[PDB]
From a paper:
Recently our laboratory has introduced a powerful mode of photochemistry into proteins, namely triplet energy transfer (EnT) photocatalysis, by developing an enantioselective [2 + 2] cyclase that relies on a genetically programmed benzophenone as a triplet sensitizer. Compared with benzophenones, thioxanthones have strong absorbance features that extend into the visible spectrum and are less susceptible to off-pathway processes that compromise EnT efficiency. Here, we develop engineered translation components to embed thioxanthone triplet sensitizers into proteins. This system enables the development of highly efficient and oxygen-tolerant photoenzymes that are powered by visible light and can achieve selective conversions that are beyond the reach of existing photocatalysts.
Author numbering: 1 to 310
The structure:
């Protein structure tokens, strides 16, 4: 058989967002993206922005930097118990950003005393633990490096009790990350994209920062330069995966394998994606035009941690 391919209408939401990624909705329904690639004087100066979904205007909420080193904010999730954004930053590690612009760096070292690595994507499980991919080398002031070729990318779990625990390493550019939950809400599997290898990895989640049974979960089509980037589950736990460089978003069933459907994009490099809460609308960033798009999926997205109730 061939993989069915659909061609939904993509509508441009905003543009001129360098390296646009990290689409996220906060608890008030406000929409945010990050511009990791913004530079000043040739040095990093990424931004976290709020987008008015009516006009498309941009508002810089945060231009994070620590001891003079600019951040590269790259992925976002909204907290449940407070309206604050957890932001994976490729130079600063993990941040917590408020709507007023104040931010704090969560960790310069991990639970074992190793220097933190720069982070790219993150995902809350329903227990409130934050699973994080770290494809970059060590955080500032170390020189910025990325695991495009060498296998030094890592996975972290920022637990509810405040521990930054490295749970695996030796990935080649770990990117998108998502949590597959059971019907009752228990975390079941952690899904991790390894971009250049065209693989999706899964672990069984046994508890906070406790993952086992590591194995290949899905195969990403194509031999283009690129592979799986951002990802998110729909309400049936179908996993939608930006396949950067393929002009497609892949759709996997809950159990992985090969994509059961592909979504053709009007651009080559989808980078991240995020459902709008309580809708079928998927917002998609792409690095061909540095723009944000939206399209309508077949069903609503899976509730993010920030939508759940205690």
């Amino acid at each position: 058989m061939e993989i069915p391919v659909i061609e939904p209408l993509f509508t441009k939401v905003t543009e001129d967002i360098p390296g646009a990624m990290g689409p996220v909705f906060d608890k008030n329904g406000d929409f945010y993206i990050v511009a990791p690639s913004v530079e000043v004087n040739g040095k990093p100066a990424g931004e976290i922005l709020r987008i008015d979904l009516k006009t498309g205007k941009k508002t810089v909420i945060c231009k994070p930097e620590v001891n003079g080193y600019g951040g590269i904010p790259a992925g976002c999730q909204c907290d449940r118990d407070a309206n604050q954004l957890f932001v994976a930053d490729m130079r600063l590690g993990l941040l917590v950003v408020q709507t007023d612009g104040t931010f704090e760096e969560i960790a310069k070292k991990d639970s074992e005393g190793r220097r933190m690595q720069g982070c790219a994507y993150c995902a809350f499980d329903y227990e409130g633990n934050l699973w994080i991919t770290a494809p970059a080398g060590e955080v500032a002031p170390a020189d910025f490096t990325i695991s495009l070729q060498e296998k030094f990318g890592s996975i972290y779990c920022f637990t509810t009790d405040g521990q930054m625990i490295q749970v695996d390493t030796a990935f080649q550019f770990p990117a998108g990350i998502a949590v597959r939950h059971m019907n009752d809400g228990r975390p079941y599997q952690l899904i991790v994209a390894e971009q250049p290898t065209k693989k999706l990895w899964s672990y069984d989640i046994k508890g906070p920062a406790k993952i086992e049974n590591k194995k290949v979960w899905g195969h990403i089509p194509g031999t283009h330069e690129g592979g799986a980037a951002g990802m998110d589950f729909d309400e049936d736990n179908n996993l939608l995966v930006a396949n950067r460089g393929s002009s497609h978003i892949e759709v996997f069933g809950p159990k992985g394998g090969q994509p059961k459907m592909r979504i053709r994009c009007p651009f080559e490099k989808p980078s991240a994606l995020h459902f709008k809460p309580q809708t079928k609308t998927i917002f998609v960033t792409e690095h061909e035009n540095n723009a944000v798009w939206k399209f309508e999926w077949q069903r609503n997205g899976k509730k993010q941690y920030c939508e759940t109730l205690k």
